[PDB]
Design a protein around this ligand. Sequence first.
Ligand SMILES: O=C(CNCCc1c[nH]c2ccccc12)Nc1scc(-c2ccccc2)c1C(=O)NCc1ccccc1
Length: 330
Amino acid sequence: STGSATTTPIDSLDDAYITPVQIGTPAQTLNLDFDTGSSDLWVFSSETTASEVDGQTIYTPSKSTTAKLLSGATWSISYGDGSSSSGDVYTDTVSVGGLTVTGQAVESAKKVSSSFTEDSTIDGLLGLAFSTLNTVSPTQQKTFFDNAKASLDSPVFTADLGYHAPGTYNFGFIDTTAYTGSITYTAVSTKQGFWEWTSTGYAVGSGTFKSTSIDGIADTGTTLLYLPATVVSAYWAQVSGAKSSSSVGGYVFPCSATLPSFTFGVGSARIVIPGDYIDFGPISTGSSSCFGGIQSSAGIGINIFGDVALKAAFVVFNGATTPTLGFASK
Ligand SMILES: O=C(CNCCc1c[nH]c2ccccc12)Nc1scc(-c2ccccc2)c1C(=O)NCc1ccccc1
C-alpha cells in the first residue's frame, strides 16, 4: 500500500504545516502537524477542557463506531518551548492520503497549553519519530508509520515541504518526479528516538564550504534551523546590521536586508537554502527588525534541521531495519 497527502503552511511565514487526517468511522477529518521530532498522535477532542479549545476541529470518539477506549492508558508530553498536552487514549482507524491503519492509538487531549489553544489551525500532532519516544503509559504505543510499515510497498515516508506553498507527505514510495538529480543517503542514529544524522558541513552565501561534522535531527515539527553558535555567527556576520537580541530571543536583522543563502552538506552532496527562506518577518507588527530563520542551538542540547532546512529538499525517511535519511535538491 501507499498514501499521499498535501501539507499546507498554516500562515504566510510557514510557521508550521498541516495535513488532513481521517480518524474514525464515519471519518472525522482533522488537520494535524506531522512531526518527525515526536512520536505521539494527539488531537483536540470532545474531552478537551472547553476553555482550552479556540477554533480547532475536535475528535469525538463517541461518534466513531470503530473507536475503543484503551483502558487505563494515559499520555503526557511537553516540548522545548514549554508547551504541553495530556489526556487519555483511544484506538481507532486512521487514514492519511488513502493509507489506512486500523487500531492506531489516538491520544485524546484533556488538557493543552496556551500555545496550542492559540493556534486555531492545528488540530493536533502526528508523530513520526521512533516509537521509543511515545509517551503512552503504561503500554507504549506505535506511531502511524510503524503501524503502517509492513503494509507499505516500501518502508519509507517522504517529506516535500513547500516554501510559502503546499507540499506533500508520501508513504510507501519515492516519487521520482519530485526532486532533481540524485538522492544522497546518510546514516541515522536512533539512540535518542530521533532521525539523527550528521551533516558534513556548511557554506554561507557564495562562501567556501567548511567541512565539519554537525550532528542534528531531521525535524518537520520545528520551524527554524538551530545550529551551533559558531555556524550561526558566521551566517549572521554576512548580514549588515544583524545582531543577537536577548530581549527578542535570537538573531534579528534589518527588514531592508537581502539575506544570503545557507548550504548544508549531506555526504558529498549540498542542499542550498535560499536567503528568502531565512526571513521570518517583523518581530512585532510594523517593526523594521526581522526575525532570523537560522538560530543558535546552544541552549537546546541538540542541533535541529527544522522546516527552514527541510523545505529546501526532498527528504526520505527510510524506516528499513537499519534506518537512513535521504536528501535531494528539488
Ligand atoms: O519537539 C520537537 C518537535 N515537536 C514540536 C512540537 C511543538 C512545540 N510547540 C509547537 C507549536 C506549534 C506546533 C508544534 C509545536 N522537536 C524538538 S527536539 C528538541 C527540542 C527542544 C528541546 C529543548 C529546547 C528547545 C527545543 C524540540 C522542540 O521543542 N522543537 C520546537 C522548538 C524549537 C525551538 C524553540 C522552541 C521549541
